[PDB]
């Protein structure tokens, strides 16, 4: 992936040239176009050049990250009009895109760890610099410390695996297997916190409500997918310890996602409800990963890609209504159909995508992740039916109470929808309904 990385490395000096924000967006969408034309990847590692290569898993993750970052520039126009350090913001986005491409193109696990910890810094910069509330300092510190406290012993695990095997390459590490409990806990707890388990989620709504949309989308669409891609790499050589210790994580991640789904029914903040919605569907992803079935891994990767697209799309809607109504809640934003009627179509087309939407990739990820949990045990049926029922109970309450009913009758005059916002909502929904025609690039990574 040297051409993409050098393209972005020479896209770096466009930040220092003024009035070039949309030019950087145009060339990043050109990168996404070229990366659409680079698809020839299969199971093993292809296009190998200077420790960089990808399989279908990493191809889909780089394509998702490139699509999210280009949309993020399109989403963040308030940086451009107020001139709120747009050069520093563009440089942060391009460097974070380099770090996410480099942690996804890693043939060895230590580049994945190194650029995975490097990607925490521009996200922390986005949190601490481009928010709007005094609790920015509470947000980036929770993100940084909840990531670092569990990601620091995983470095000791990495060096323990390296001494035992002698290499970090993902195929040479597939041959070995380990029967150590603490090695399993080090190599799992960092991904178990980085993608939120119910007991360790805390940092997620604090990082999401405070964060700017260009900063909430990179936490929702990706960077929870680092904690899924890490398990997709790690569980291959820790299968016996995973069969010893899966049931506690499956029980926690299936009780959460019901409790988490009951939380969203009793919350009024629009950005916090999508923040807890990221916990519940990747509770399904986390439950499907630790069952090592082939359908579990394939449907897990499908729901990672599709859930990233629909959660970033749902966080797109929560900032359009925020900048027009001054502050977001359920009470202020009640019934926006009479204010913005054309925005309501994307509101339902992306809130329905958060649950099982019929021609989207969210349903195809969800229909095959339920297969692994049902084939795992029949006890899990009771707490899956409640999970999906309460899932579409809360995610239809979002559209339901925000887009129907009487107006607030205390709001002032705001601007209407623009060409940028409808184009922004289109590129989150129509990829969810268009990649189902070639879902094997997002199902089969094996």
């Amino acid at each position: 992936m040297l051409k993409i990385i050098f393209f972005l490395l020479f896209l770096i000096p466009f930040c220092f040239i003024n009035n070039m924000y949309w030019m950087v967006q145009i060339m990043m969408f050109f990168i996404s176009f070229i990366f659409l034309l680079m698809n020839n990847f299969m199971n093993y590692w292809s296009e190998i050049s200077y420790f960089l290569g990808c399989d279908m898993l990493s191809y889909g993750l780089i394509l998702l990250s490139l699509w999210i970052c280009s949309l993020m520039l399109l989403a963040s126009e308030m940086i451009n009009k107020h001139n709120n350090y747009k050069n520093l913001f563009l440089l942060n986005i391009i460097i974070l895109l380099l770090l996410l491409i480099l942690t996804f193109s890693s043939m060895s696990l230590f580049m994945f760890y190194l650029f995975f910890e490097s990607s925490l810094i521009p996200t922390l910069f986005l949190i601490l610099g481009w928010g709007y509330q005094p609790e920015r300092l509470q947000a980036g510190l929770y993100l940084l410390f909840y990531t670092l406290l569990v990601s620091l012993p995983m470095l000791i695990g990495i060096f323990y695996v390296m001494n035992k095997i002698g290499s970090m390459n993902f195929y040479l590490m597939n041959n070995f297997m380990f029967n150590y409990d603490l090695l399993y806990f080090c190599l799992l707890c960092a991904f178990l916190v980085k993608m939120p388990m119910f007991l360790v989620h805390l940092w997620l709504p604090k990082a999401h409500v405070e964060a700017p949309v260009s900063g909430s989308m990179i936490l929702a669409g990706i960077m929870l997918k680092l904690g899924g891609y890490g398990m997709l790499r790690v569980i291959s050589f820790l299968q016996l310890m995973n069969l010893k210790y899966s049931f506690v994580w499956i029980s926690i991640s299936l009780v959460g996602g019901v409790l988490v789904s009951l939380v969203c029914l009793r919350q009024t903040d629009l950005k916090a409800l999508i923040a807890y919605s990221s916990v519940a569907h990747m509770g399904i992803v986390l439950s499907g990963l630790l069952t090592m079935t082939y359908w579990g891994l394939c449907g897990s990767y499908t729901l990672m890609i599709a859930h990233g697209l629909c959660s970033s799309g749902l966080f797109c809607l929560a900032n359009v209504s925020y900048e027009r109504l001054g502050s977001r809640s359920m009470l202020i934003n009640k019934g926006l159909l009479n204010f913005m009627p054309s925005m309501t179509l994307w509101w339902f087309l992306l809130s329905s995508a958060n649950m099982a939407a019929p021609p989207t990739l969210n349903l195809l990820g969800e229909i095959s992740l339920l297969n692994s949990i049902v084939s795992w045990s029949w006890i899990s049926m009771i707490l899956l039916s409640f999970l999906s029922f309460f899932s579409a109970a809360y995610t239809l309450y979002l559209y339901s109470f925000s887009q129907h009913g009487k107006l607030f009758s205390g709001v002032y005059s705001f601007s209407s929808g623009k060409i940028r916002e409808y184009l922004l909502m289109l590129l989150h929904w129509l990829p969810l309904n268009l990649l189902i025609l070639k879902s094997e690039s997002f199902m089969l990574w094996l």
């Binding site: 308030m78 709120n84 928010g131 709007y132 509330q133 005094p134 920015r136």
Partner: peptide, 13 residues
């Protein structure tokens, strides 16, 4: 952009 460090944030140090 709406909130910036006020002197009340400056007071605790």
């Amino acid at each position: 952009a709406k909130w910036y460090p006020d002197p009340e944030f400056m007071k605790q140090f």
